[PDB]
Ligand binder design. Sequence first.
Ligand SMILES: Nc1nc2c(c(=O)[nH]1)N(C=O)[C@@H](CNc1ccc(C(=O)N[C@@H](CCC(=O)N[C@@H](CCC(=O)N[C@@H](CCC(=O)O)C(=O)O)C(=O)O)C(=O)O)cc1)CN2
Ligand SMILES: Nc1nc2c(c(=O)[nH]1)N(C=O)[C@@H](CNc1ccc(C(=O)N[C@@H](CCC(=O)N[C@@H](CCC(=O)N[C@@H](CCC(=O)O)C(=O)O)C(=O)O)C(=O)O)cc1)CN2
Ligand SMILES: *[C@H](NCC(=O)O)c1c(COP(=O)(O)O)cnc(C)c1O
Ligand SMILES: *Cc1c(COP(=O)(O)O)cnc(C)c1O
Ligand SMILES: *Cc1c(COP(=O)(O)O)cnc(C)c1O
Lengths: 465, 456, 455, 465
Amino acid sequence: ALWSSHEQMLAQPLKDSDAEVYDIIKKESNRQRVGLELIASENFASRAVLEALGSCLNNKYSEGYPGQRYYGGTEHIDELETLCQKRALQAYGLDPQCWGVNVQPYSGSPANFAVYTALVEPHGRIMGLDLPDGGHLTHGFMTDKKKISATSIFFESMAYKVNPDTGYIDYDRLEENARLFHPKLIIAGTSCYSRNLDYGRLRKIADENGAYLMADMAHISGLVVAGVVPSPFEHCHVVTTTTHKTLRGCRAGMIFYRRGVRKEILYNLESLINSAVFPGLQGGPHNHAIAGVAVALKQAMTPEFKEYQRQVVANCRALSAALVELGYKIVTGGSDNHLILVDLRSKGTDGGRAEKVLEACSIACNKNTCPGDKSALRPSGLRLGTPALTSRGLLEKDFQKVAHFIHRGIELTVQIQDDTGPRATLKEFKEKLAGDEKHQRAVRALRQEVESFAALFPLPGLPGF
Amino acid sequence: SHEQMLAQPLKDSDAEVYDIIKKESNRQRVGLELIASENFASRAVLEALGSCLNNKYSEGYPGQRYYGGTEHIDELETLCQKRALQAYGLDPQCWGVNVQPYSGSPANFAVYTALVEPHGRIMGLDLPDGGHLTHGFMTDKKKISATSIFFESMAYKVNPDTGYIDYDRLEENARLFHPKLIIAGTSCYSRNLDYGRLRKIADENGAYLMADMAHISGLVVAGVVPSPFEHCHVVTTTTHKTLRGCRAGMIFYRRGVYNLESLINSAVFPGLQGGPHNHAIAGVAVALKQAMTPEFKEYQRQVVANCRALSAALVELGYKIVTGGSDNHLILVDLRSKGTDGGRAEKVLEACSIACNKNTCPGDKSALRPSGLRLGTPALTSRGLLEKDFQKVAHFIHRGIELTVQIQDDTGPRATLKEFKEKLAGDEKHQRAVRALRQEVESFAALFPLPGLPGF
Amino acid sequence: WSSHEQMLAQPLKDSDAEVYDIIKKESNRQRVGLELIASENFASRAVLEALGSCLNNKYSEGYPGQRYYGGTEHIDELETLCQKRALQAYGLDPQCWGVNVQPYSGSPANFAVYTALVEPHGRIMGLDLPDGGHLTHGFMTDKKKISATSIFFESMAYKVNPDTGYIDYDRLEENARLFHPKLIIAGTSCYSRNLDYGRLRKIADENGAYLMADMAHISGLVVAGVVPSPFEHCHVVTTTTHKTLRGCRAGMIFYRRGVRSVDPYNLESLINSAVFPGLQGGPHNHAIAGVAVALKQAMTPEFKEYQRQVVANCRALSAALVELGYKIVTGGSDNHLILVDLRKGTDGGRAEKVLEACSIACNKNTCPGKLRPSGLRLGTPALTSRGLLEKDFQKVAHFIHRGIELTVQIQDDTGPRATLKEFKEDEKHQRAVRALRQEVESFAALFPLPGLPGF
Amino acid sequence: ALWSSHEQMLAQPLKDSDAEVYDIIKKESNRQRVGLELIASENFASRAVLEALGSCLNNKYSEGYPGQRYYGGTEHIDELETLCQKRALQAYGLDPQCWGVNVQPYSGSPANFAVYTALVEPHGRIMGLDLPDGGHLTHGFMTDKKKISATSIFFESMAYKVNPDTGYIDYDRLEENARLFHPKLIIAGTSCYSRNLDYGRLRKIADENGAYLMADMAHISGLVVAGVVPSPFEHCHVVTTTTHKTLRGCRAGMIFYRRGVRSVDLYNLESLINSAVFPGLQGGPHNHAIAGVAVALKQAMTPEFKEYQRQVVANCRALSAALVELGYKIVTGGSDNHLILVDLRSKGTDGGRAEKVLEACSIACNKNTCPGDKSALRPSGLRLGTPALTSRGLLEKDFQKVAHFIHRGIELTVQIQDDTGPRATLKEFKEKLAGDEKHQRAVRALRQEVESFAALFPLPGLPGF
Ligand SMILES: Nc1nc2c(c(=O)[nH]1)N(C=O)[C@@H](CNc1ccc(C(=O)N[C@@H](CCC(=O)N[C@@H](CCC(=O)N[C@@H](CCC(=O)O)C(=O)O)C(=O)O)C(=O)O)cc1)CN2
Ligand SMILES: Nc1nc2c(c(=O)[nH]1)N(C=O)[C@@H](CNc1ccc(C(=O)N[C@@H](CCC(=O)N[C@@H](CCC(=O)N[C@@H](CCC(=O)O)C(=O)O)C(=O)O)C(=O)O)cc1)CN2
Ligand SMILES: *[C@H](NCC(=O)O)c1c(COP(=O)(O)O)cnc(C)c1O
Ligand SMILES: *Cc1c(COP(=O)(O)O)cnc(C)c1O
Ligand SMILES: *Cc1c(COP(=O)(O)O)cnc(C)c1O
């Protein structure tokens, strides 16, 4: 009686099949185009990458690995996953006899948890940079009464902090505490840290306690491939990372691991990690995303990419320099990478407040706590990254105009705080910011300008989509 | 290097990947895709996956985000939840839903974390009886599944003489094990589950009754099988398979009197996941809207019609169908009913371009000799195949099996089936037959449309 | 203040009149009563004499040959001697069996074995409590875990057929395939029958699990060969040193030595390491001494006859209550005890209280499926150590019988909403309680009370 | 067998029922009489106590508690357990409105484990003084590859150390680490520490992390009752202890706990601790031992006992002073209690060697590492306690002659180490002490004068057995 319209329902372009969702995608693209994206974890994926996501690769189930699958008809997915692993090892200049890699993790958090499952039995001890000091949830997060992060729930985690007076990680206190905590694995990775990680030192600390040194290069993965920051692959046993962010691919994760001699006493990391990801934690691999990651890896090895990362770091340096010239304090004085933590205290306000004033001006960036911050209830900083805007073509001069936009945003934030009063609440702040001509007026002007400037730049991706 | 490759198309930026995708699209077109868990996503859905939604981080939930600029992602995730609850005819005052799970397995593990603390006891169908890894799975050594590592799982089996679940033995064993949660869901079970009974057993032990409708999610939306939302406290599911969307998962939960919402939500984040995959959420949304169309409803009826026809055909051809038949989209064929196993069959059928996988089957020689083949109809039905067509498919599979009992008898009974794969290889005689059959199968499958983008 | 040396020497009778009276009042209580609690016995004078030796003063952490303190020469003779006698008493070969005699009690011994062979969260399988299992074999509810074995380990129980009172070895065999136990327990606290160790062994091997026997209740029966030995099939056998072995309170852990499935057993190191530096501290040498003394007495002919008599009495008692129309689970017993199903129209919950008021000691048992104990467990070791024979145990059966008539009596006068109420016996009852108590105590005083004089 | 032989076997005095054993006992008593017992954990139980152990109380099964038993006929055991709890709460000057106590623990280690089980679920975090610094196994013990103490096996333990330069506990580092470890319970108790514990400071640290402060007064329990050292019952939520050692009772343990309002409202320790001991971990109580503990408690409240404890501390002060006058170094310079940790390094040897030379001279005492000691194997010190010998009546003068005996012991230990050859060690040392004349003749001489003097003092007990 039917089955006639059915064929086309599964054939029409998104625009007609569902106007609502399509309308949402179009307003998102406009939003991304006129705004100044400064969130350190954001970037814009190339057309080639996005083009792969929508392929028929979405349809195939390939549980297992090349050579050892559970389904039939994986010949092409096998070339794909294999090809992707080749490029992944290549992109980071790794030798196949000394390194192996898994490309099925669904995202960044899944990769980390998989490595914990494979090498750290349940309740095994894990050590990672404390959250308020730039750490990531997946590195463990708990309070004096509740285990929040799943890494803290299924395992025993204890954090190491950074020196409150330098913003640097306290390798000395980590070394000492590792002897009392007996970690099975130590994490070398940050989410809001503007400096390089002393992997060499961390490696010795691990070896002293027989622990594994796992690096989480999610934020600097792209910087590493381009050689603008030391590689973690020269000290760590395992390296996990997201494939988006500075690597500029689609969302997914990878787990790199050592192979060979640690021929007396060998690395049995491959078997574990692989079994952990499957049949351990994941099910069918998302081949379409694996393709996207593959495409990204190939672009990542081009000189244009190395060029891009070069510029990403230069821009952070210009931004970092301009805000300083304007009197803003930068945690640890500056950066070695794509981001910087601005301690808004030097201006008499917090990132909790600036977060809002700036967002209303189409300048995206998120609040974050600086060393010593009394409460996470009122974070003294703002994290700023350059990958996104640099993928847009902005150069040093441009980022200097950005620093000024951000600056004005902070002044309004302070101007408004003058009214609310010191003891004023955060709810009261948004209230006063939301209901006041003097302010709303300024917000209309700033926003206008910020957007005007953004509109002057291209926006990578499926054309206006 | 003032070059901007951020725009050059895939066909130019990466010919290698481009080829693999082209070769995969042709492979999918000329083959008879019978794997029960596969389907072909619509073009609209795939289109969404490549949108700019890929670029936004929106950790948390609408109303409660950690980032700024989520106005549109909020409208999306919210829209998706509306459609999810709608598709299954659920009342928002009684049901809530989380649409951030990255896949099917992540969704289950999230529910376990939220409702079953570590080491909590879970009960699910034993895998060899059609259960899924994520429902727990272990041995006398390295527990394969993570659900079996961070939790204490004990399985319930199906009657070996009927292929049916032994709800009686589960009821008794639940009194000794004290499960905190019981799973109602299958990966290879041709029948409807007695949710009502499973509900009565959960309550008897204060346990939660979690349904995993991943395999019949599409069947359920179109009302071709009873709904699990009628008895269960929680229902999780993939968004692909019979729902025909992109890969992702969802978690439905009860609201009223009951704080499953808080836990589940906190479990997915900041518990187990990070940034939501908005582009995939969009894809699931698009699929949900198509799932509520009449065209979808008929498609599902057809999917089930085809399964019966196929089942019937293989039966008329003397093949053993576990429990005699099916109420859904799949059937477990008991090999050995022709004198062979799905272990080798999967390999030859595969060489003939007929895709389907072997399956543990009730007890059998577990992993050593899967006395069965699982066959599903969603994928081919999305292609338009009707009963008559599936009748011809049954014959193609049949011939595949005859060519299997063949190479087997021609293979030493010591069965170095780890070379059988090699005896299929090179041996021009079998490779000859493989081609003869493969030819006919591809000619026949090309007669039907391949959903998705163009020849991409 | 200018003394103290006086105090250290003064007899307890002077130093503590309160405790002394308690001891005397407890000794008289034990003398005039009919002790039927299956887990109770009367230690000999020799044993009790050892408990008060100077052995109480030495710390000897570790083992003979490998101590952490100095001056253990004599404690080393002791522990070693005790181990020799322990293996001997059960006719075991040192090349095949080894033993650890430091466990503080029965429950500590089991927990030590679990810790040594079953890492945390390891699965253990044991007889369900209501079916005669012991707490230490795991015990939990739909809601919470009551036993530590159930808290630091994942336990699943196996039940006894509700229609026969017999263990369902079939359902255990099947369930063991789904649960994957790392260790299965062969032992009971209230089961009148012999366990099928051979079958239990065939089931452990099928799952690669260990077969641990808990012979606490029949330890004495085993030494005298009045019941099959668990050392014929089990990898490990734990046990109390009191109960039917008639020693002081303490536990032991026997283990296999040699090769399990060699083809070109290290239970010793593990268990030993588990007891120390694992779970315990300083051994209780004075108690080890008391266990040694009891083991030597356990190998005498006088002990063997005693055990035969213990079983003879149980049969007689069982038979008598049967002829009295009482329900004995599984119809009878192969050992020292029997589970009486008070159905007579009452329960062991209230029975225990009245019989207790009549000076007939025995506790309520959790018969096969209700906080509402349905039966009464009765043991003969204690009274038999007193010299009672069949004829005497026949008169005991009647004393108990009358006790039940006075019980099943107040239950009609009761609520039926019993509870703290029923714990009221009015004089119409107190008078009877006294009439029966007299008759019991007078008969009870016809027999010798082993051990040191109650004064 | 004639039931008269059976009835008599159960009636014969030990001397006749078992010769081997009765003979062992007799040789042990002789040994204890002629030797100088200096091991800090050793003491001599009174006759009254031992007399209680052998009572018929051995026979009764009384699972549960007074008022709520599982067996019938506990009338007298109920007076006993109740009586014992009254005295336990009394001896320490505790008010029943604020404190309760369980007297069924079989020993010291069982009491601690019971408290962990009741208040700290499995894998809960526990913090205790590191073993090498004077901690006890039950407070947790593990290495960088294996959990040894059961406390470390069924729970997550992390230790807090003492300052290597003072021998004092580092309350500052504990405070800091507690914030990263999030302990659920902190242990205030030592096995080899000559100083008082800052319970008030530890209590604040617990409260800062919502943790319970558990004190383990096994070593100073008797000192506390007599008030010669501050009481732990002033700051701790729970106090566990052995009943032997300085309390001079039979082997057993007790668990004291708070009752009433913690600050909430209230304290919920009673139900848990009691449920943990049973049906949790233990079975039938050892009533005969509970009686012994009761008798000891009554003696513990006499003025003779308080007199004894003062003398115990006075003797440690004389002994400590004498060894110092002879040039021996005492960790932390001295002691506030019954023991002292001598750092044999000042003489060029170790407690591993002195342990043996001194034991062969009938002078009992055990080796023990001193702060900083280069990873055990060769522990620098010797622990020395005075309870045992003081219960024997030794006074200041006497303990000065002991110091001299010990001194000579060390010289021999070094005279032979002179033949040793610095590098040649361990198994070789003993081979020389027990293999060449001059020394043996030296040992025979010393030993003799040691035993003679020892035979000049009484020996608490059954007057011979
Ligand atoms: N009912 C049902 N069907 C389903 C699923 C499901 O969850 N349930 N799946 C989900 O949606 C897919 C299958 N997924 C599975 C993935 C892993 C394991 C598993 O048992 N894992 C172990 C042991 C297997 C094992 O090692 N196998 C044998 C033979 C080797 C092997 O690969 N065997 C093949 C061929 C079988 C044969 O002919 O021997 C096999 O399929 O088992 C061994 O001892 O080494 C592992 O090591 O990964 C099982 C099923 C498809 N069909
Ligand atoms: N087969 C057998 N017989 C044996 C033993 C054995 O191990 N096995 N024993 C060894 O050699 C002795 C008995 N020892 C026992 C010790 C504890 C429990 C027990 O069930 N444990 C807890 C449960 C509490 C419990 O879970 N509480 C519930 C209510 C259940 C319950 O029974 N309620 C009341 C009792 C009824 C009443 O008076 O109201 C209660 O206060 O516990 C809760 O509300 O939290 C207890 O305290 O009774 C049973 C027997 C003698 N006979
Ligand atoms: C006992 N002493 C050990 C020592 O160092 O000499 C002890 C105990 C254990 O008691 P036990 O009867 O179980 O052997 C527990 N806790 C402490 C602090 C000490 O000191
Ligand atoms: C396929 C399936 C899953 C898991 O799906 P993935 O996204 O591949 O993890 C979960 N449950 C059931 C019942 C399934 O059939
Ligand atoms: C009595 C008994 C125990 C425990 O003995 P306790 O010394 O009181 O802890 C253990 N197991 C069984 C089978 C028992 O009968």
